[PDB]
């Protein structure tokens, strides 16, 4: 039953992700570049004397950068395991997945500038 | 003309949700697993005497489960459509699937422990 | 090498969201239809003397509309690369996207009460 093992396999989203996060890393590390530098940044302000609220609300906008960058090594990866076709055929998928990403990034910056104005000081 | 349509398609989301969510329902139930399961425990703390706020940030980390699972499923529907050699192929974009969500309740965690902290009590 | 090269193109974001928004704009422009559509409504709220932290969480659910249409313009977008046997095979990921979005909108709703009873008055 390939239908109920799928669903097995989101089960064991852990183990799954070994793999995943494995191409990831050989194929498209933007999960690093962007995903984890902005968490990082977010991590200094939250360290320093910030309110609360703030600092939930910056950890959300890292979670937007870092899953669409999981989703953007996703692409690539499937591309890999076929061939040049499916590498250029896919490019219209990851041109919208970076659309994704600068979009999460872009009204984040809004609420970021907000927030600091607020409650970082 | 199908570039229209499928525009069409995605201005009535609520019909084509139908045969969506029933091969979610069928092939990947981790909408409800963990989704729908998450959802419910915001609700109780919601129910409670908590602050508005602190509702309105933990539903925003109900939906991130929520549409990581059916994107998740999405991936599996797909699949069943042709057969073996894709449920095999997209492994990889399941396996991505699954560190996304992964990262979503991680992050969501910190987040949720810091909302006790401060407003459930 | 088409894997280095595929990161390549997630460096230049920007760049690779202008063939992505193009084939957006002429296949599925639900991104102006929810998406600017509801950040239209929400930049009014924020014009409008109201809290911070609530124009910061409206965004939030702005770009929770905005990306995942975005994601339904890419499933299209590579279908018209190939032809109609894939414009029918994705329909049921699309089908999933539009519960995507059902579900930000709804739980979004819910969210968006609540900040309107607590601070927009």
């Given at each position: ?34 995903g984890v530098a ?54 219209r ?29």
């Amino acid at each position: 039953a390939n239908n109920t093992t799928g669903f097995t396999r989101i089960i064991k989203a852990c183990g799954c992700s070994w793999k995943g996060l494995r191409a990831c890393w050989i194929n498209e590390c933007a999960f690093r570049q962007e995903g984890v530098a902005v968490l990082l940044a977010v991590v200094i302000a939250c360290w320093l004397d910030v309110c609360a609220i703030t600092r939930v609300l910056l950890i959300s906008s890292v979670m937007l950068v870092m899953i669409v960058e999981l989703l953007n090594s996703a692409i690539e990866a499937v591309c890999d395991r076929i061939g040049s076709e499916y590498h250029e055929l896919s490019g219209r998928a990851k041109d919208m997945g970076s659309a994704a990403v600068l979009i999460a990034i872009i009204d984040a910056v809004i609420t970021w500038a907000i927030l600091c104005w607020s409650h970082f000081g």
